[PDB]
Amino acid sequence: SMSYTWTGALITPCAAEESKLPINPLSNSLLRHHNMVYATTSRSASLRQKKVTFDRLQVLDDHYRDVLKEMKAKASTVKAKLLSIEEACKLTPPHSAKSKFGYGAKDVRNLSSRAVNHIRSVWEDLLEDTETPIDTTIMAKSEVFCVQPRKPARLIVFPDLGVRVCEKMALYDVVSTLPQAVMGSSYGFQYSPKQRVEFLVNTWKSKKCPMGFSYDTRCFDSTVTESDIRVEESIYQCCDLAPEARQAIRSLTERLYIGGPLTNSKGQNCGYRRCRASGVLTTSCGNTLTCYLKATAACRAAKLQDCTMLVNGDDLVVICESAGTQEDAAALRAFTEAMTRYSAPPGDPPQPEYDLELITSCSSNVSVAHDASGKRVYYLTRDPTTPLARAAWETARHTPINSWLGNIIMYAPTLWARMILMTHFFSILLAQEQLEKALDCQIYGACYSIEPLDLPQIIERLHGLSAFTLHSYSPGEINRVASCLRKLGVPPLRTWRHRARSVRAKLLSQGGRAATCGRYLFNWAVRTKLKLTPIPAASQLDLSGWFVAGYSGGDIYHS
């Protein structure tokens, strides 16, 4: 069937859309080529619609069915609990889109009588009506990028606030627990950046002669078929569930997940969806299971030997035993045709790689550096172009989500995050005296309220003390970073080093937590280093649940 059908009505904005980077002194000291930075808007929506609209092709075989049964056998060991209304309301982000029925996220979190009453009726309706398509809003997503040597806006589809709360009740425990039980070490969202690097490296070292590749499915969500979503539900149904949860899952599958009507911001009928919706609770879990299922069966069809896969939603990386240059290229080609029959055709053609560092998965690649003792340490990094473009944007315009904060946390060990992001933002935070003000950021899709002054402990716990002492980075990484800075008009690293010394001093002057940031975050700045010892209040922090599951588009907030 067609992934989408359109009536002709437009995907509209619900307010003015900013597309260009302003000329601001604060952002200009970070990035001068302000004209190279842009944000996507609804104006490019028709271009995206055209790309995600097509008839799907899907042929299932024995390999597919064997793998499905194996996954279900593992899912059979799970017992998922129904979340209470209170627990589900607490998982709702303070700024989540308000319901069109007279209440908002704040009311949901406060458990107001109106929000609670509407949520109960929505839940009851899910138990009674097993067929009626639930409405969804379709919007053009606003994302920042650097011009290429432009990208059309991604399309987000989500249901009303009341429905999102019910999804949590019926499926939160499932999507946070089932992937792990089914996929084991292959489930990517269970790893912190350090654990992910460790997994990739150990897996690479375990092979006699490793070969690996990332596999890019062209617009994954639109390739998800009605059958894929029903197979996905068949897996969830293997869990021990409360009667109402089982019905809720059955109803939500037929009424929301397999598809439904699309309504624009103006309340007009935009069309119909018969593929994965980006903004529902099961998107991350569902995409991971579907991608893992198809890739696993595809590997067998392709005769790939000793495969170890790592899946994060639609992002897939595979490491296996090489059978020779020609044999690998042909086997990879067969793998791609197998995935194509499964309705997972390639965007960028996959290429076999024999150097772990040349593989990009989850937008990252493994690289090497050295700690104080000169010992080699692997870490995750990436081309800093987008992170820097977004950092400049979030500096000039106040944004709800602070990607720069998430990047510092996730890429703390990298040359660019330490010398540029940390330096740039602490400088501004010091100047505006907002070092203690908490800010929102996202980690694996979930929203986190974090205080800049807690970064040292967070980084230690997540990456280890070596994150504050890495040096002697690889020439390729350095060159990639340097090339990026010249392209965007970002001052050279030497300038950042000089700015960091000034920031570090101001931090040390204030003492307390502020001074701790100076000692650990900027120890790379001073020639006469300080012996860095484990941070006291670090081993106490509650990072439980930080890296357990993916929730992209799931509307999840963690307190």
From Swiss-Prot:
Entire protein: shown range: 2420 to 2982 of 3010
Task: List cofactor names only.
Answer: Mg(2+)
**Subunit structure, per the record?**
Homooligomer. Interacts with non-structural protein 5A. Interacts with host VAPB. Interacts with host PRK2/PKN2. Interacts with host HNRNPA1 and SEPT6; these interactions facilitate viral replication. Part of the replication complex composed of NS2, NS3, NS4A, NS4B, NS5A and the RNA-directed RNA polymerase.
What membrane topology does the annotation report for this chain? Single-pass type IV membrane protein
Superkingdom of origin? Viruses
Locate the RdRp catalytic domain: which residues? 210-328
Spell out the reaction equation it catalyses: RNA(n) + a ribonucleoside 5'-triphosphate = RNA(n+1) + diphosphate
Known role: RNA-dependent RNA polymerase that performs primer-template recognition and RNA synthesis during viral replication. Initiates RNA transcription/replication at a flavin adenine dinucleotide (FAD), resulting in a 5'- FAD cap on viral RNAs. In this way, recognition of viral 5' RNA by host pattern recognition receptors can be bypassed, thereby evading activation of antiviral pathways.
- What are the subcellular locations of this protein? Host cytoplasm; Host endoplasmic reticulum membrane
Phosphoserine occurs at 29, 42
Listed binding positions for Mg(2+) 2 are: 216, 314-315
Q: How is its activity regulated?
A: Activity is up-regulated by PRK2/PKN2-mediated phosphorylation.
Query: What is the protein's given name?
Result: RNA-directed RNA polymerase
Modification(s) after translation: The N-terminus is phosphorylated by host PRK2/PKN2.
Q: What is this organism's lineage?
A: Viruses, Riboviria, Orthornavirae, Kitrinoviricota, Flasuviricetes
Give the note describing cofactor binding and stoichiometry. Answer: Binds 2 magnesium ion that constitute a dinuclear catalytic metal center.
